[PDB]
Amino acid sequence: GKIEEGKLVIWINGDKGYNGLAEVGKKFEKDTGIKVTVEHPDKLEEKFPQVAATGDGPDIIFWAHDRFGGYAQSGLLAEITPDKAFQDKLYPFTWDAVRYNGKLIAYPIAVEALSLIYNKDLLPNPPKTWEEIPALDKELKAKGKSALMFNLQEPYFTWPLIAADGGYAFKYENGKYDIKDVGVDNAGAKAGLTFLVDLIKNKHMNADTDYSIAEAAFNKGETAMTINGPWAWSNIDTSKVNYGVTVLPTFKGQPSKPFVGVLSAGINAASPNKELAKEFLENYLLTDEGLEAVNKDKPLGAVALKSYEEELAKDPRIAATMENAQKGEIMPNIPQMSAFWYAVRTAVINAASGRQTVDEALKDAQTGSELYRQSLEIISRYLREQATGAADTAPMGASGATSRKALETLRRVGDGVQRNHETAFQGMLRKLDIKNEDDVKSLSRVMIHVFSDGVTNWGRIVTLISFGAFVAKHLKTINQESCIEPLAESITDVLVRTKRDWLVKQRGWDGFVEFFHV
Ligand SMILES: CO[C@@]1(CN2CCN3CCOC[C@@H]3C2)/C(F)=C/C[C@H](C)[C@@H](C)S(=O)(=O)NC(=O)c2ccc3c(c2)N(C[C@@H]2CCO[C@H]21)C[C@@]1(CCCc2cc(Cl)ccc21)CO3
Ligand SMILES: OC[C@H]1O[C@H](O[C@H]2[C@H](O)[C@@H](O)[C@@H](O)O[C@@H]2CO)[C@H](O)[C@@H](O)[C@@H]1O
């Protein structure tokens, strides 16, 4: 459970230029005598936060920037402190992608956007609209071909169509995300996902098509079109297909809006090799020579390094990548992105398979995407009003009727539990001996052990939160009132992470209000 000193272990996704990255490793070894091991484990973006939490895992993790804010919030990433001269070598917007709470938490590498990739021997002119693809598939089926195949197992690839007519993740306005405002189950998201489920119903696409199936069908010339990123171009070059890379089709006359990723390199907070990792990333990888070694293996897209991006900018495939990037949006890096992606992944798979309707599927995705913020609103307000004797005057905001009725229910059932179990609550309080901000952060491991060692039901959830309020009254008492909000975030995190699937099957806090209805 300790990262070894005097080497570098690196994790990067299996679709990226990991052999190219290993050659940059070898150059580092030649100068320093330090061995660089590059690994591409399956589901590395799920494995990282698990292994890093115990002070294990790689020295360096590569992913798109969207996952890095959760990593940072959980204390898993070393702060990045490049000097000016090095910061000035990368585009300022790429540094913005790896800024979390005013601190740089990664090195940006490259800008990725999806494009439409078409076979010019099947489709001299690619379609400008999604709406013309059914008619084009009918023409191509008559010659033993299909119009379009892309990965339907990862919401990344379907999001551009969902977003086109007004689906969104977290509303962005006046240079600010409203994390309360989620656009997964609106009329625009519904129209985009209904169009996708209609293509599958009409046998223009297959619900089971994944990355490998779509890639093989395009690269063998069986399908005229795919949707993929720059990393995919190497294998198409090898297939000798006469391909173009172009703007994604419009939907209802509006651009497809890809979620734009910055491939980023983070340093593990538990690494004893932080100076070696900084030296490797700044003076070996993020050079014209280091990025070229990776790019030549699998293309990176529009690199963060200004000197190299100027050389690659002339490539029409890159110009097309940035066209689809500027019609799209830079992904948020807020901790909730992980939950957003899980929720939308399940909705797309379930709608495509017929397991749920589009309305049922996006309903559950909206509930899943809102769950952390709504749970924190309820739990934070209950802890603080129990501590101080006075309620919060601030509007509840989005889904406010549910937050209000959940807080009302919690006051009734929670107060009942605190009273009937006052002796048991006092006994556990003294036994924990909670004195400061440090002791509060150690409760997280105890909460997970006890709250997860039992049945899932609303009764045990009321106990988690009610004991939370009991501790909050104590923290007010000992002039540790500034610990109540951190405590509320820790309780919320334990609840939503461990009971995510059960909470969504109950329709979240509406199920809570219903279950305890008098
Ligand atoms: C008897 O005393 C407890 C139970 N415990 C169980 C674990 N064993 C382990 C060995 O030591 C002794 C202890 C005793 C009590 F009163 C139970 C009455 C309830 C009503 C039940 C009938 S129930 O079924 O409905 N629910 C629960 O069993 C329950 C659900 C969530 C909780 C917890 C229980 N517990 C343990 C309860 C709290 C009071 O006494 C415990 C609290 C918690 C952990 C501490 C740290 C902590 C910190 C914060 Cl801020 C919030 C929650 C927690 C996590 O949440
Ligand atoms: O599908 C949800 C998924 O989307 C993004 O992951 C992309 C990644 O950004 C690309 O570099 C490429 O590897 O394909 C991945 C999709 O399979 C998000 O970055 C990721 O967090 C999210 O789970």
From TrEMBL:
Protein name, as recorded: Maltose-binding periplasmic protein,PigG
Lineage of producing organism: Bacteria, Pseudomonadati, Pseudomonadota, Gammaproteobacteria, Enterobacterales
Residues of the full protein shown: 2 to 368 of 468
